[PDB]
């Protein structure tokens, strides 16, 4: 599937209740702090073409931390 509703804002349908800057998947805001806040040092592991619209996934940290970050969600420079 191409795109209908985000609210991940990227990975690409799952939502809820708007925290920081984006529309997030709740899974995403969880992911966002999970990597950023406590458990990231990363270039991307899978590869940085690790794909999320909804054909996809192919999901990892840096890749779509940074694509979810295109809609600069704040788990930001967290908490660093
Ligand atoms: Zn998501
Ligand atoms: Zn990846």
UniProtKB/Swiss-Prot annotation:
Species this protein is from: Homo sapiens
Function per UniProt: Receptor for retinoic acid. Retinoic acid receptors bind as heterodimers to their target response elements in response to their ligands, all-trans or 9-cis retinoic acid, and regulate gene expression in various biological processes. The RXR/RAR heterodimers bind to the retinoic acid response elements (RARE) composed of tandem 5'-AGGTCA-3' sites known as DR1-DR5. In the absence or presence of hormone ligand, acts mainly as an activator of gene expression due to weak binding to corepressors.
Gene: RARB
Portion annotated as DNA-binding: 8-73
Disorder cited: Microphthalmia, syndromic, 12: A form of microphthalmia, a disorder of eye formation, ranging from small size of a single eye to complete bilateral absence of ocular tissues (anophthalmia). In many cases, microphthalmia/anophthalmia occurs in association with syndromes that include non-ocular abnormalities. MCOPS12 patients manifest variable features, including diaphragmatic hernia, pulmonary hypoplasia, and cardiac abnormalities.
Tissue and organ expression note: Expressed in aortic endothelial cells (at protein level).
Zinc finger (NR C4-type): 8-28, 44-68
Subunit structure comment from the entry: Homodimer. Heterodimer; with a RXR molecule. Binds DNA preferentially as a RAR/RXR heterodimer. Heterodimerizes (via NR LBD) with RXRA. Interacts weakly with NCOR2.
Protein name: Retinoic acid receptor beta
Family, similarity comment: Belongs to the nuclear hormone receptor family. NR1 subfamily.
């Amino acid at each position: 599937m191409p795109r209908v509703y985000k609210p991940c804002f990227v990975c690409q349908d799952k939502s809820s209740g708007y925290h920081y800057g984006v529309s997030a998947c709740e899974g995403c805001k969880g992911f966002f702090r999970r990597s950023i806040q406590k458990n990231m040092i990363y270039t991307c592991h899978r590869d940085k073409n690790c794909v999320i619209n909804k054909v996809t996934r192919n999901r990892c940290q840096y890749c779509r931390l940074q694509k979810c970050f295109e809609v600069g969600m704040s788990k930001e420079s967290v908490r660093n």
